[PDB]
Amino acid sequence: KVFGRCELAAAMKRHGLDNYRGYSLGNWVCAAKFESNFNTQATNRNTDGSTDYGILQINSRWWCNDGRTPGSRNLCNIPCSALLSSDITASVNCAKKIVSDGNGMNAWVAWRNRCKGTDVQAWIRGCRL
Ligand SMILES: [Cl-]
Ligand SMILES: [Cl-]
Ligand SMILES: [Cl-]
Ligand SMILES: [Cl-]
Numbered sequence: 115k116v117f118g119r120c121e122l123a124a125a126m127k128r129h130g131l132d133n134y135r136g137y138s139l140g141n142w143v144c145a146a147k148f149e150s151n152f153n154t155q156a157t158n159r160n161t162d163g164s165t166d167y168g169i170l171q172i173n174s175r176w177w178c179n180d181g182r183t184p185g186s187r188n189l190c191n192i193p194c195s196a197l198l199s200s201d202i203t204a205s206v207n208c209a210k211k212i213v214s215d216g217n218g219m220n221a222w223v224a225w226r227n228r229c230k231g232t233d234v235q236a237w238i239r240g241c242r243l
């Protein structure tokens with residue numbers, strides 16, 4: 115599924131990301147836009163042989179099992195395909211774990227480069243939240 119911006123905002127809010135580890139919802143919507151273009155089905159292979167999956171481009175080196183990233187971890191205890199579902203529950207739960215890990219939302223390159231330090235409230239403008 116390709117979410118609309120506010121549609122994704124609402125989904126992320128219902129699933130508990132708004133202000134999760136102090137990151138207001140706009141940060142998460144912004145990260146998703148630039149991580150996946152709001153596309154739950156997005157995948158992108160990394161140089162190290164891991165892949166990123168889903169709306170929040172969660173990586174198979176540490177977070178999910180995709181069966182083809184040797185000596186990786188699966189800290190979210192999920193198959194990476196779970197992160198591609200139209201339903202973003204698994205992605206959000208895994209996102210919570212990642213952001214909790216020490217590095218905050220710096221774990222998402224798109225968030226560091228395109229959302230950190232920007233007016234992220236803009237991403238939830240207009241939304242009925
Ligand atoms: Cl698995
Ligand atoms: Cl959802
Ligand atoms: Cl933080
Ligand atoms: Cl915000």
Ligand code: NA
Pocket residue numbers: 174175176177178179180183186187188
């Ligand atoms: Na893995």
